[PDB]
Write a protein that binds this ligand. Structure first.
Ligand SMILES: CCc1cc2c(c(CC)n1)CCC(=O)N2Cc1ccc(-c2ccccc2-c2nnn[nH]2)cc1
Length: 393
């Protein structure tokens, strides 16, 4: 970690600034020397897709070579006995330190700064996120118990309904991180590792859900419209493998968040770094993660609802999770496209930019509100579940 070695340099400089003898300066500069050596092996936050041979990365590596040199002169002075002089040469780290934050950490976008930074958002969103997390954690963990004991994982539908609980449960585990981020007025105090994992976990939830909701739709279509000899041993085998592949595809689809997300200054923010290219990539996610599956899902359900309006309790559950999921993503879908128009230069108006940046935290809340609401859609099984509960004990 570059951020870790960067803290190793700043804290060891404070040791040198208060050091009395040369032995205190020697041991501090030795730790700093090894720190800048493996930090040279690393890649800065703004050069995520730059070959370790490009003039950009070479300028990064050369930067720490000068830093090693400044430390090497200070070590030479400490070995001679000069403490007051070794401390002066160590203070040259602050130049390289301020040169690194201005080159790779300051991401000044300006144009419409402090947009969507209203007093009610920093209070409304963390209070709403507290509820989604707490309600959803107890909700989905009860769903996992119900699937293992009431459903006993005997159907194909049961397997996908369990995986959706785990996927929803995973996203929920990262929710208090995004709650305090908003409460601290978009200040990220968890570093670079959690900025990447917490952003990839939000991305992963969308893809895995969309993939599971497609699988459950096809399952409902084939169960109701085209029934065939149920070879459970083979159907359970294919359903178990399909879910592994889903977690793999959603993992691979959320890889950009692990690559281009970093912590940057303006107050630190956990944001995506843009290299023309996002236009031809933002069009690829819509035609795969919303237009293509919702097309497959609707075709399955238009055929199944028609053949059932005159397994069904499960269909009600799968239909309610599918209908709510897509009607909650529409607000965010409109404003995400509108945010793209701000980032390009089509709509260059801070009055409009504010309306979009004040609504996006509210729209991303509703588009992820299903993780706490999905367990509540199991109420269709309530009359049959109380029948099992009483018969048990
Ligand atoms: C709902 C919790 C959540 C998140 C959040 C903020 C908030 C508080 C309003 N709450 C602040 C804004 C922000 O960037 N975040 C993180 C985020 C991470 C991933 C995605 C995402 C979703 C689908 C597909 C791709 C991505 C993606 N990958 N990399 N960058 N975006 C969107 C937002």
């Amino acid at each position: 970690d570059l951020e870790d070695n960067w803290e190793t340099l700043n804290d060891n400089l404070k040791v040198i600034e208060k050091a009395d003898n040369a032995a205190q300066v020697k041991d501090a500069l030795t730790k700093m020397r090894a720190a800048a050596l493996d930090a040279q092996k690393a890649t800065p936050p703004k050069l995520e897709d730059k070959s370790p041979d490009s003039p950009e990365m070479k300028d990064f590596r050369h930067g720490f070579d000068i830093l090693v040199g400044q430390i090497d002169d200070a070590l030479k002075l400490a070995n001679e006995g000069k403490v007051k002089e070794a401390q002066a040469a160590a203070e040259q780290l602050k130049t390289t330190r301020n040169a690194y934050i201005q080159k790779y950490l300051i991401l000044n976008s300006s144009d419409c700064p402090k947009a969507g930074r209203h007093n009610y958002i920093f209070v409304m969103i963390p209070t709403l996120y507290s509820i989604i997390f707490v309600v959803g954690i107890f909700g989905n963990s009860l769903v996992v118990i119900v699937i293992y004991f009431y459903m006993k994982l005997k159907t194909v539908a049961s397997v996908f309904l369990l995986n959706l609980a785990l996927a929803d449960l995973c996203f929920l585990l990262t929710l208090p991180l995004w709650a305090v981020y908003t409460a601290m007025e978009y200040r990220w105090p968890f570093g670079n590792y959690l900025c990447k994992i917490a952003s990839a976990s939000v991305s992963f939830n969308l893809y895995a859900s969309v993939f599971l909701l497609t699988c459950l739709s096809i399952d409902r279509y084939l169960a109701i419209v085209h029934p065939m000899k149920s070879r459970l041993r083979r159907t359970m085998l294919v359903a178990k493998v399909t879910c592994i592949i889903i977690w793999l595809l959603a993992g691979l689809a959320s890889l950009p968040a692990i690559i281009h997300r970093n912590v940057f200054f303006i107050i630190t923010v956990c944001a995506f770094h843009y290299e023309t290219l996002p236009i031809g990539l933002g069009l690829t996610k819509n035609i795969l993660g919303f237009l293509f599956p919702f097309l497959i899902i609707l075709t399955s359900y238009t055929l199944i609802w028609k053949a059932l309006k005159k397994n069904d309790d499960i269909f009600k559950i799968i239909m309610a999770i599918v209908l709510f999921f897509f009607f909650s993503w529409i607000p965010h879908q409109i404003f995400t496209f509108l945010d793209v128009l701000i980032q390009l230069g089509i709509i260059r108006d801070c009055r409009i930019a504010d309306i979009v940046d004040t609504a996006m935290p509210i729209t991303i809340c509703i588009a992820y509100f299903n993780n706490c609401l999905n367990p509540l859609f199991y109420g269709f099984l309530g009359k049959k579940f109380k029948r099992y509960f009483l018969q048990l004990l």
